[PDB]
Ligand binder design. Sequence first.
Ligand SMILES: Nc1ncnc2c1ncn2[C@@H]1O[C@H](COP(=O)(O)O)[C@@H](O)[C@H]1O
Length: 376
Amino acid sequence: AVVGIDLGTTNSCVAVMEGKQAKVLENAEGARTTPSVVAFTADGERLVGMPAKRQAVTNPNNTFYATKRLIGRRYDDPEVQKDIKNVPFKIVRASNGDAWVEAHGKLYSPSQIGAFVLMKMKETAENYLGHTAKNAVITVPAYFNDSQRQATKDAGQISGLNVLRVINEPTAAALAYGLDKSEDKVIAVYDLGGGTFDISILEIQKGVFEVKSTNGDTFLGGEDFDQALLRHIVKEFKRETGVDLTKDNMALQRVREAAEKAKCELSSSVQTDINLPYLTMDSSGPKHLNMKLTRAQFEGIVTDLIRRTIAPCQKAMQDAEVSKSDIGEVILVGGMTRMPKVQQTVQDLFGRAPSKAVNPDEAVAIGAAIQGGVLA
Ligand SMILES: Nc1ncnc2c1ncn2[C@@H]1O[C@H](COP(=O)(O)O)[C@@H](O)[C@H]1O
């Protein structure tokens, strides 16, 4: 049996072919996705997944996130240099010219950081399978070159996985939607995840996919929506109480989590309450944070982020030499696509209601598992 792993910028997901239906596997914590985050504390204990995510704000120097931006890339790559200016952890030039990360004077390749995450996904699968997992299909963005693909394969190898194939994310997503069995058609894959935005224009010809064009923004993702809201919360709180939370990393840790939670609630509700008891303390005693946030308010806060998905999409269509009319179906990938205003932007972009049929953040792993089943 061959597992399908989406080793994502922000989050990862593992699925496997069970019958004629793929199944996304929950981890021990009951979570269908696992944060692609690896941290090393003062103790030097290693945290992976949610335990690591939970301390990313209080341990910014030694928490590695979005290392997928580094994997397979030379230190001197522009995108690595851009990454350096956006993350608080240390990125270093390895002896061999590659971009690695450092923490507590220890050096790790992005393949090593990936391997920590994959070991967690491998355990998750084995915990369901009841036997060791060896064979895997791993997904990568369509734009990955051979070097990035090879580094991703090496990540899997380190973890004890034989990566039978590396396949592209938009293709994996297309498989999950069954486009495999569709009549010839042009497909837009609109992919807004936690860390990056991708738009792919694919064509299905006789059941086989072709990537006509690709575009996006590697530095536009759900995390930025969370940060925009956290910024609002911090400003509002300071006005409300006089207290500046930017000085307390622990409070910010709690606000960033509450902001993400708020954003997700506003996809199904028009108002949400942000509540953080004993967030800080004053000469009057404990201070509690209590804030109502409407979907209209949240939309206002992140409108620029959403609009940034527009131009990349128009260019992708121009590069694929099609008009909106020529596109037969838009599929949504990435948890962010659950946001109503994002869905509306996608609709305005392509002149059709996007397809919501498959779980947005499970589509890629499901596709991976389908391709796995074939390979097996
Ligand atoms: N129901 C939801 N509403 C809004 N955003 C969500 C929802 N579920 C997940 N997300 C976001 O989508 C991103 C996860 O996408 P991915 O990286 O593809 O797993 C994260 O930034 C989440 O905050």
